[PDB]
Amino acid sequence: SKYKLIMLRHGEGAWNKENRFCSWVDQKLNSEGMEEARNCGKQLKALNFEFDLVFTSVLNRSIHTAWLILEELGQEWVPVESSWRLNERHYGALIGLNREQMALNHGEEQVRLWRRSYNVTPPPIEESHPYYQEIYNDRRYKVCDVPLDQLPRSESLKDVLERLLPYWNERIAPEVLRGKTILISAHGNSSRALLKHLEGISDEDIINITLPTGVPILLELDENLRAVGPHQFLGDQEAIQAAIKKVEDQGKVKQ
Amino acid sequence: SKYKLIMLRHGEGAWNKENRFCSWVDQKLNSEGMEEARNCGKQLKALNFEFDLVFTSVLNRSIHTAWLILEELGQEWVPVESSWRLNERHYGALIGLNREQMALNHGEEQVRLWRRSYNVTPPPIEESHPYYQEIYNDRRYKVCDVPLDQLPRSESLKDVLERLLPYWNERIAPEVLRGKTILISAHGNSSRALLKHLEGISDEDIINITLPTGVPILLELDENLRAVGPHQFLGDQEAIQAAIKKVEDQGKVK
Numbered sequence: 001s002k003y004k005l006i007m008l009r010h011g012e013g014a015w016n017k018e019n020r021f022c023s024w025v026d027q028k029l030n031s032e033g034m035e036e037a038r039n040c041g042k043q044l045k046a047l048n049f050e051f052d053l054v055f056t057s058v059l060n061r062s063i064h065t066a067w068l069i070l071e072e073l074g075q076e077w078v079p080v081e082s083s084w085r086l087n088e089r090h091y092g093a094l095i096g097l098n099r100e101q102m103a104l105n106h107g108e109e110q111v112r113l114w115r116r117s118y119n120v121t122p123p124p125i126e127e128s129h130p131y132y133q134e135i136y137n138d139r140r141y142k143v144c145d146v147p148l149d150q151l152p153r154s155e156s157l158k159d160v161l162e163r164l165l166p167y168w169n170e171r172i173a174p175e176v177l178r179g180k181t182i183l184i185s186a187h188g189n190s191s192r193a194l195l196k197h198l199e200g201i202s203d204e205d206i207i208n209i210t211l212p213t214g215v216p217i218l219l220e221l222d223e224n225l226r227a228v229g230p231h232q233f234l235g236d237q238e239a240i241q242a243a244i245k246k247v248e249d250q251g252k253v254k255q
Numbered sequence: 256s257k258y259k260l261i262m263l264r265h266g267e268g269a270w271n272k273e274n275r276f277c278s279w280v281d282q283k284l285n286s287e288g289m290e291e292a293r294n295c296g297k298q299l300k301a302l303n304f305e306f307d308l309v310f311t312s313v314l315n316r317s318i319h320t321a322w323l324i325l326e327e328l329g330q331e332w333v334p335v336e337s338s339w340r341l342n343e344r345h346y347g348a349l350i351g352l353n354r355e356q357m358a359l360n361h362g363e364e365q366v367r368l369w370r371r372s373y374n375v376t377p378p379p380i381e382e383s384h385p386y387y388q389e390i391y392n393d394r395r396y397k398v399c400d401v402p403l404d405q406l407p408r409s410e411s412l413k414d415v416l417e418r419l420l421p422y423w424n425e426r427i428a429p430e431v432l433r434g435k436t437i438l439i440s441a442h443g444n445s446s447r448a449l450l451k452h453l454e455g456i457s458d459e460d461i462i463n464i465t466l467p468t469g470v471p472i473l474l475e476l477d478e479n480l481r482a483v484g485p486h487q488f489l490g491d492q493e494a495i496q497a498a499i500k501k502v503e504d505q506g507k508v509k
């Protein structure tokens with residue numbers, strides 16, 4: 001048989017309007033991001049989706065996005081599970097910094113490696129970093145399945161997959177094989193990591209994949225939980241392609 | 256108090272202005288009801304509550320109340336679990352009717368009996384009722400731990416406790432004993448039901464218990480999960496007392 005699930009990246013936040021890496025900083029959605037979530041819900045309602053389970057990260061923007069979608073669907077009673085393993089990639093010391101500023105300071109090539117490469121690891125975030133405390137003093141990281149001191153201080157996309165894959169195999173994949181309709185409300189790079197795995201994208205090719213925000217991602221899997229075909233985006237394709245470019249352009253020097 | 260837990264009933268719903276028995280009909284919170292939820296979260300945050308698990312009914316107003324509370328607490332990550340067993344008492348045929356109009360026509364004492372009695376079972380809702388289809392056709396009841404045809408069509412407060420107690424004993428109680436701080440976002444009568452049980456309130460005394468909306472109810476339990484003392488409403492008692500009278504007045508003429 002074949003199985004379909006929905007994956008999506010939450011919408012806008014104050015920091016991305018400023019083009020700053022947010023990552024593990026628990027920023028809330030802004031008005032726009034909230035609306036993008038509701039629009040995703042309306043599209044899903046149009047397709048008459050009836051979810052059985054929802055998985056999110058422990059970053060509140062991921063959870064609020066799910067809640068907004070469920071409300072649009074009148075499905076607020078559907079079980080939700082949140083895990084740090086779906087958290088956006090940890091950008092380490094790059095957290096809070098302006099992407100275009102990084103391109104000017106280190107060049108576009110380096111920035112593209114930091115943002116999209118598979119193996120490159122961002123410099124780790126140190127205790128002196130402006131957002132260090134706000135992150136590691138939060139109780140949500142004191143009750144994860146890994147000790148607080150063992151949580152990453154930065155992650156390469158490969159690092160993300162290593163901590164996300166076990167969660168997918170052990171808690172999400174089984175539900176898919178049981179025919180459950182699943183919604184994964186994740187982030188830009190945690191989503192790319194999952195896609196890289198399910199579609200068997202190469203270490204090299206994954207660098208060219210950029211996901212637009214607030215856009216339902218359609219993915220169909222076979223009996224072996226491997227992608228039957230490339231992931232697709234639900235909505236106006238031209239607008240989605242333009243949004244993908246805007247994300248890419250955030251790491252480019254003006255011209 | 257070896258264990259402490261918070262329970263509360265959600266604020267005003269979409270039918271509150273009309274003062275109609277909502278019960279199993281899935282109406283959403285109105286503007287005021289949302290604020291009541293937010294104020295609850297603020298009050299809980301001021302008292303340093305850190306929840307580890309939240310239980311709600313499957314009625315959206317109860318879930319939304321929990322979500323708003325969690326947001327004020329910055330605890331949106333805390334696990335939430337929902338069950339029809341925490342649903343408000345099923346008002347049967349009385350669903351959709353105006354409380355005050357009933358009081359006018361049948362007498363305040365009669366309506367008070369229907370609302371707070373422990374043993375009186377309201378007339379069952381019938382297929383001809385305006386809100387029957389809307390309730391029993393909903394997918395949330397298709398995936399219950401009980402067959403659709405087995406779900407009640409009306410419930411006395413005693414019936415409510417009977418289908419709520421199992422959920423408490425099997426899912427909630429164990430967590431409390433594990434030291435977890437729990438929040439129960441329930442309803443006017445399902446909350447009364449749980450209180451009767453936990454505080455060992457008599458069949459007669461339970462009739463005089465009316466719970467205010469949007470007010471956190473602190474319950475302190477011992478090793479046997481039995482209330483050590485009476486439930487405590489967290490907030491200004493005078494304002495809380497008025498919130499209670501508001502509920503009682505819903506069944507009074509004028």
Ligand SMILES: O=C(O)[C@@H](COP(=O)(O)O)OP(=O)(O)O
Pocket residue numbers: 009010016020021022023088089091099115116186187188189247
């Ligand atoms: O790291 C972040 O803040 C972005 C991704 O940024 P880029 O890797 O695309 O630059 O993830 P999001 O929080 O928007 O889901």
Ligand SMILES: O=C(O)[C@@H](COP(=O)(O)O)OP(=O)(O)O
Pocket residue numbers: 264265268276277278279343346354370371441442443444502
């Ligand atoms: O819908 C209901 O019947 C009320 C209780 O009504 P009364 O027994 O207080 O009249 O429960 P709620 O929806 O507010 O949680």
